[PDB]
């Protein structure tokens with residue numbers, strides 16, 4: 001039984017290879033008093049008198065001491081396994097620096113004493129989860145958004161696009177525009193309410209101006225939301241104004257291109273002879289791609305940018321907030337993957353840089 | 361003729377999430 005640990009900026013996804021979903025999902029946080037430290041949910045359930053730190057920023061591990069606490073908590077507290085008895089598949093962001101993946105390997109072998117391990121690119125695993133080995137993935141989570149074009153299991157690094165806005169920014173923006181409406185969301189508990197409103201009632205409009213006009217002249221787009229204590233508030237055009245930022249980042253002051261444009265730019269940076277297969281295999285993954293309407297809007301926007309004869313297909317699997325993990329669960333449970341593991345024996349001979357030769 | 365070729369074929373014919381054991385998620389997102 002190999003393990004699969006998908007470490008995100010906001011959420012850890014962990015479980016056992018061969019399972020259809022992670023056993024444990026919890027915030028990628030470590031907390032200290034404003035005991036010594038609180039990791040994951042016990043830090044979350046104490047979000048009021050501790051200072052929280054995120055060891056992963058924009059998909060990149062930046063605090064290795066707290067990351068070790070996350071990995072320890074994952075193994076012992078969540079999965080209830082001894083890491084010495086299980087090969088462990090880990091995930092990394094696209095373009096993860098060489099020094100980072102080497103220290104990932106070193107900590108797994110030297111600190112947790114895993115018998116074997118592997119590091120896979122997150123977006124590649126999401127493509128695998130949809131049964132594909134060629135395509136272009138839009139991966140949008142809590143801290144970062146990427147376009148990753150992939151040819152037969154290999155990400156094409158020169159064509160990878162990035163957008164430094166994701167779910168946390170959208171939560172903050174929904175907070176901002178709900179307060180401009182007249183509500184108050186200032187406490188940490190109230191921020192969690194805004195995140196829940198975002199995940200439950202927000203959607204992507206097919207056309208922003210048409211939708212704004214509908215919300216201005218009728219109540220047909222308004223939704224009731226019951227707060228935990230009992231009050232009912234009304235959410236109107238904030239429902240689609242918040243995720244509109246993915247297509248128009250200027251709503252939060254970013255002049256970067258929106259996700260339809262990073263997708264098109266990514267495909268255009270690939271060799272012309274694979275662009276046809278990329279256009280027909282656009283796979284959406286990550287929690288921030290869960291908005292209703294996002295596939296239909298991406299289809300409309302990419303169609304407007306691509307040649308008129310190009311077949312455009314957006315694939316948005318219902319499980320895509322766990323697509324990376326599911327792809328790792330598939331990969332690590334395949335018989336042909338057995339020889340791909342980095343073994344502790346291999347690590348002792350070559351050292352941490354073995355990950356460059358075995359994981360690509 | 362390559363191990364990578366066989367792995368890619370195995371990914372395409374894996375059945376996806378369909379053939380994975382149904383488990384329960386203790387999801388605290």
Ligand SMILES: Nc1ncnc2c1ncn2[C@@H]1O[C@H](COP(=O)(O)OP(=O)(O)OP(=O)(O)O)[C@@H](O)[C@H]1O
Pocket residue numbers: 007008009010011012058059140141142143144145166167168195198199200285286287288289290291321
């Ligand atoms: N149904 C939903 N609608 C909109 N957003 C959602 C939904 N479900 C989850 N999210 C958002 O997805 C984000 C987390 O997704 P994910 O686990 O893919 O990110 P991550 O891996 O933690 O971070 P990153 O991939 O950026 O490093 C959170 O911001 C969460 O609010």
Ligand SMILES: [Ca+2]
Pocket residue numbers: 007008009122141286324
């Ligand atoms: Ca992620």
Ligand SMILES: [Ca+2]
Pocket residue numbers: 248249250254255256
């Ligand atoms: Ca703009």
